C-alpha cells in the first residue's frame, strides 16, 4: 500500500540506474537528502499513520469511546515522536536511491517571500475596494474590520519590526514605502469620513513613515512606485500652499490637514535627516517635488496658533 498510494498520487517512476548465519547489510548511511525529497518522505510516512488510524477508528468504535494521544495529525508530530515513525519511510528512500528509481515533480520564493508585510499589503489592496465602497455610500462590515483589527496590527508590527527590516530585506523595502503612499492617500482632504472612531490612522501613518526601509532603494530603483511618492509629496506641498488662501486671507476641509498631515511631514523629514540619507534621497521623481517644495516653503516663509507646528516642520525639513 505504501507504493500503491505513491503510484496513485500521479507520480512517475523511471529506472535511472542499476540496483547495487550472519546477514550482510549494505551500508546505506552514505546518501544525503534533498529538500524536495523531504516532502515525499513526510507524505509517504503519513500513509502508515493514516492506514493505522483508519483501523483504529473501527477499534475505538468497538471500544465505544476514548481519546488517545497518538491519534493526532502528522503536522502536529515532532522529531521526538517522528523518531518512531520516520524510520520506516527513511529506510525505503535510500533503497529507492540505490536501486536506481527516479521521481520527478531558491527556497525564498517557496517560503514566505511576500511575508507578513506583503500579506498586510494585500489586505490593504482589498481595503482599497472596501474604502471605495465606503466613500461611495458616504457620498458596513469592512469599516469595523479596518477600524478595529488591522490598523492596530500594522501599528504594532511596524513598531516591533522597525529594525532588521529597514537596513535585511530588499523586495519588502520597495513596497513598504508604497504602502505608506496608499495609507497617506486613503485619508482624503477631510477626516470626517473616518470620524472620531479612528483617530489612530494619524498615528499609524506616523509609524509607517518612521519605518521607510527603501530610504535610498526607492530612489535608486527603476522607479515603479516612485511616481506615487512624487504624487504624495506634490499633494502635500499643494495642500500646504493652499493654506495661504485661508490663514493669510481670513476654514473648511483645510484645517483638518493641519492636525493629520503636517505632523506626518515632520516625521518624514526627521526620518530622512536622522540617518543622513541625503546621499541619494532626492533622485528621479523626487527633484520634481523638491524644486516645488523649496518654492512652497519660500511662499509660506512669511506666514496664529499654528506657528509652532510650522516652525517644527521647517526645522525638520
Amino acid at each position: 500500500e505504501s507504493l500503491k498510494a505513491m503510484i496513485a498520487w500521479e507520480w512517475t517512476i523511471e529506472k535511472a540506474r542499476e540496483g547495487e548465519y550472519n546477514p550482510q547489510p549494505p551500508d546505506l548511511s552514505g546518501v544525503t537528502l534533498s529538500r524536495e525529497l523531504q516532502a515525499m518522505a513526510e507524505q509517504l510516512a503519513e500513509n502508515y499513520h493514516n492506514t493505522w488510524g483508519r483501523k483504529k477508528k473501527q477499534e475505538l468504535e468497538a471500544k465505544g469511546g476514548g481519546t488517545h494521544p497518538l491519534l493526532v495529525p502528522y503536522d502536529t508530530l515532532t522529531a521526538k515522536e517522528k523518531a518512531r515513525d520516520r524510520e520506516k519511510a527513511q529506510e525505503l528512500l535510500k533503497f529507492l536511491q540505490m536501486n536506481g528509481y527516479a521521481v520527478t515533480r531558491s527556497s525564498i520564493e517557496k517560503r514566505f517571500a511576500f511575508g507578513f508585510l506583503q500579506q498586510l499589503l494585500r489586505w490593504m489592496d482589498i481595503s482599497q475596494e472596501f474604502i471605495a465602497h465606503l466613500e461611495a455610500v458616504v457620498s458596513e462590515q469592512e469599516i469595523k474590520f479596518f477600524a478595529k483589527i488591522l490598523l492596530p496590527l500594522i501599528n504594532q508590527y511596524f513598531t516591533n519590526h522597525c529594525l532588521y527590516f529597514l537596513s535585511a530585506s530588499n523586495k519588502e523595502k520597495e513596497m513598504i514605502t508604497s504602502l505608506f503612499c496608499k495609507l497617506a492617500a486613503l485619508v482624503r482632504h477631510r477626516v470626517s469620513l473616518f470620524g472620531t472612531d479612528a483617530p489612530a490612522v494619524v498615528n499609524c501613518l506616523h509609524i509607517l513613515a518612521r519605518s521607510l526601509d527603501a530610504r535610498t532603494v526607492m530612489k535608486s530603483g527603476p522607479e515603479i512606485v516612485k511616481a506615487g511618492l512624487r504624487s504624495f509629496f506634490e499633494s502635500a506641498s499643494e495642500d500646504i500652499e493652499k493654506m495661504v488662501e485661508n490663514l493669510r486671507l481670513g476654514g473648511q476641509n483645510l484645517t483638518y490637514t493641519t492636525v493629520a498631515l503636517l505632523p506626518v511631514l515632520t516625521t518624514l523629514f526627521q526620518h530622512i535627516a536622522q540617518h543622513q540619507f541625503g546621499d541619494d534621497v532626492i533622485l528621479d521623481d523626487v527633484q520634481v517635488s523638491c524644486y516645488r517644495t523649496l518654492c512652497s516653503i519660500y511662499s509660506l516663509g512669511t506666514t496664529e496658533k499654528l506657528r509652532p507646528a510650522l516652525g517644527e516642520c521647517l526645522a525638520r525639513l
Binding site: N47, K57, P73
Partner: peptide, 28 residues
C-alpha cells in the same frame, strides 16, 4: 479527533517493474 481520510490504494495495480523492489525491500 483526527477523523481518518484514507487515500485509495487498493484499486491501482502495481506494475511488473516494482515487484522486484517489493521483494528486495522485504528481504532487506
Amino acid at each position: 479527533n483526527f477523523d481518518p481520510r484514507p487515500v485509495e490504494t487498493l484499486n491501482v495495480i502495481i506494475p511488473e517493474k516494482l515487484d522486484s523492489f517489493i521483494n528486495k525491500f522485504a528481504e532487506y
